[PDB]
């Protein structure tokens, strides 16, 4: 109820992928996407990133829980700002 649609994630193994993070977060509700912070000196991620959610009603529990399992390693998550891309303005059009 009036929370944000995204979260921060940190403590990831170098073994863990962006697709692993996207998969492991789906246990609470639909994850739309995930991304990681890459180091251009190594082309590996720094052990941290972000996850996009279908609804802020899911994100409330995800962000309330401090620690989350990914590839059996535990990581923490935190608040992150939303981004506008959806549109609710559909209509139930039809005829007899």
Describe the overall structure.
The chain has 96 residues and is of the alpha+beta class. The chain has one domain: Alpha-Beta Plaits. It has helices at 18-24, 56-64; strands at 6-10, 31-39, 44-53, 67-70, 73-80. The chain has a five-stranded antiparallel beta sheet with strand order 2-3-1-5-4. Strand 2 (31-39) and strand 3 (44-53) form a beta hairpin. The longest helix is centred in the middle third of the chain and has 9 residues, at 56-64. The PDB classes it as rna binding protein. Keywords: RNA-binding protein, RRM, RBD. The assembly is monomeric. Refined solution structure of musashi1 RBD2.
- Report the CATH superfamily: RRM (RNA recognition motif) domain
What is the highest CATH level, the class?
Alpha Beta
Q: Would you list the SSEs in sequence order as H and E? A: EHEEHEE
Amino- and carboxy-terminal Cα gap: 38 Å
Task: Please describe the biggest sheet, giving its number of strands, its sense, and whether it closes into a barrel.
Answer: 5 strands, antiparallel
Protein name: RNA-binding protein Musashi homolog 1
Main location: cytoplasm
GO molecular function: identical protein binding; molecular condensate scaffold activity; poly(U) RNA binding; protein homodimerization activity; single-stranded RNA binding
GO biological process, one term: epithelial cell differentiation
């Amino acid at each position: 109820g009036s929370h944000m649609k995204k979260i921060f994630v940190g403590g990831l193994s170098v073994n863990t992928t962006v697709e692993d993070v996207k998969h492991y977060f789906e246990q609470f509700g639909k994850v739309d996407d995930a991304m990681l912070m890459f180091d251009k000196t190594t082309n590996r991620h720094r052990g941290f990133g972000f996850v996009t959610f279908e609804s802020e009603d899911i994100v409330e529990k995800v962000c309330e829980i401090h620690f989350h399992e990914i590839n059996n390693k535990m990581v923490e998550c935190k608040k992150a700002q939303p981004k506008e891309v959806m549109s609710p303005t559909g209509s139930a059009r039809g005829r007899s």
